[PDB]
Enzyme design. Structure first.
Site, short mmCIF file in Angstrom:
data_model
loop_
_atom_site.label_atom_id
_atom_site.label_comp_id
_atom_site.label_asym_id
_atom_site.label_seq_id
_atom_site.Cartn_x
_atom_site.Cartn_y
_atom_site.Cartn_z
N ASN A 8 0.74 -1.27 0.02
CA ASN A 8 0.15 -0.08 -0.06
C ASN A 8 0.77 1.13 0.15
OD1 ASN A 8 -2.42 1.36 0.29
ND2 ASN A 8 -2.18 1.66 2.40
N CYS A 13 -5.62 2.57 -5.00
CA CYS A 13 -6.72 2.03 -5.12
C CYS A 13 -6.69 0.52 -6.07
CB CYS A 13 -7.45 2.86 -5.99
SG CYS A 13 -8.04 4.51 -4.96
N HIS A 246 -12.01 0.00 0.14
CA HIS A 246 -10.83 -0.88 0.19
C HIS A 246 -11.07 -1.68 -1.17
CE1 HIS A 246 -7.16 -2.51 1.87
NE2 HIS A 246 -7.65 -3.69 1.69
N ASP A 263 -4.59 -9.36 -0.82
CA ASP A 263 -4.77 -7.90 0.19
C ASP A 263 -3.37 -7.10 0.28
OD1 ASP A 263 -6.25 -6.02 1.73
OD2 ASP A 263 -7.24 -7.52 2.74
#
Ligand SMILES: CN1C(=O)CC[C@H](C(=O)N2CCC(O)(Cn3cnc4ccccc4c3=O)CC2)[C@H]1c1ccccc1
EC number: 3.4.19.12
Length: 326
Positions: A8, A13, A246, A263
């Site tokens: 991240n 996005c 998310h 993730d």
């Protein structure tokens, strides 16, 4: 698992989810590795930045960073990702690569994988006039409201729209005409990118189902018996929330049905149900990737370390060296 994740690093996005999607499109990955980026600037070549992020996801024991890639195609304003949508990021990535491969032993790989063809037509009812215009497509945009499942979308997509009333068609010489306009799939690409129109902006979280196995012969104008248009679910791109949001993606990279959730920095095995039905709709899918059954094994071909030319590895390793001034 074998698989490493992406850090991240921004309001990037859907970028991270889309990077994994293209990475496990192995036939792409290996072509991307064949591009001649040897002479290219290390900071403003998107082709070279895809090579690095791919390389890293094949070699990195730790989460991979994407700051250099972001900086290469220069989406760097506060609403850069908010303003655009998924197909757009991929067209920026794929068009860079497509162009960079021209005049190599892997030219045409992007169109081969992703390009399908379509006819758009308008026909006058009352008088003899007909317009027919073929189109290429790299991605299809499916309508979601009033549709319970993908088949209704596809059915809606090939629907005959009526040009009547104040909404009649201007038929040139023939004046305003009562007309029928619609769309037909002439072919379907080995890799099928679908977007679900959930943004109308506002996010519709309505129920919409998609199959593990997707037969689309009835949407082709001409069905091939030798290559029937049957698709296998490959990635399920997921958003949760709104405006809030998310992003994650579900993949079974091998086409085998052993799923993982990707993730960002963490990657984890999951049930089919988590990947499929649990994203039917706050956690729901906005993009689906399907691979044709006949082409499953070429697209998801094995990728060894030797498939990367050592000129590239040397370049990249060198880069890693300096950068590692911690
Ligand atoms: C909630 N939300 C925001 O706050 C900002 C943008 C954000 C977003 O990530 N998007 C990427 C995925 C999409 O591109 C899917 N899609 C693709 N093509 C379309 C063509 C025509 C009509 C609609 C669509 C469409 O929705 C939407 C935009 C959006 C969002 C919206 C629905 C789901 C998940 C996130």
């Amino acid at each position: 698992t074998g698989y490493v994740g992406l850090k991240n690093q921004g309001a990037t996005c859907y970028m991270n989810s889309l990077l994994q999607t293209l990475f496990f499109t192995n036939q792409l990955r290996k072509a991307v590795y064949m591009m001649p980026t040897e002479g290219d600037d290390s900071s403003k070549s998107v082709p070279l930045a895809l090579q690095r992020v791919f390389y890293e996801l094949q070699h990195s024991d730790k989460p991979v960073g994407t700051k250099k890639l972001t900086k290469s195609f220069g989406w760097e304003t506060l609403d850069s990702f908010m303003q655009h949508d998924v197909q757009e990021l991929c067209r920026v990535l794929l068009d860079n690569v497509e162009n960079k491969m021209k005049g190599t032993c892997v030219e045409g790989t992007i169109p081969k994988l992703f390009r399908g063809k379509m006819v758009s037509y308008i026909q006058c009812k009352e008088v003899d006039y007909r317009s027919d215009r073929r189109e290429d497509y790299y991605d299809i945009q499916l309508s979601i409201k009033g549709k319970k499942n993908i088949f209704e979308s596809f059915v809606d997509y090939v629907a005959v729209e009526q040009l009547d009333g104040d909404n009649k068609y201007d038929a040139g010489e023939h004046g305003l005409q009562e007309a029928e306009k619609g769309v037909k799939f002439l072919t379907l690409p080995p890799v099928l990118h679908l977007q679900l129109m959930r943004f109308m902006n506002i996010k519709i979280n309505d129920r919409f189902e998609f199959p593990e196995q997707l037969p689309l012969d009835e949407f082709l104008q001409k069905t091939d018996p030798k290559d029937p248009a049957n698709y296998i679910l490959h990635a399920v791109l997921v958003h949760s929330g709104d405006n809030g949001g998310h992003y994650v993606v579900y993949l079974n990279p091998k086409g085998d049905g052993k799923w993982c959730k990707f993730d960002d920095d963490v990657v984890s095995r999951c049930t089919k149900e988590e990947a499929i039905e649990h994203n039917y709709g706050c956690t729901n899918a906005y993009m689906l990737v399907y691979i044709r059954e006949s082409k499953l094994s070429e697209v998801l071909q094995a990728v060894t370390d030797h498939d990367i030319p050592q000129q590239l590895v040397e370049r990249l390793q060198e880069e890693k060296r300096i950068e590692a001034q911690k």
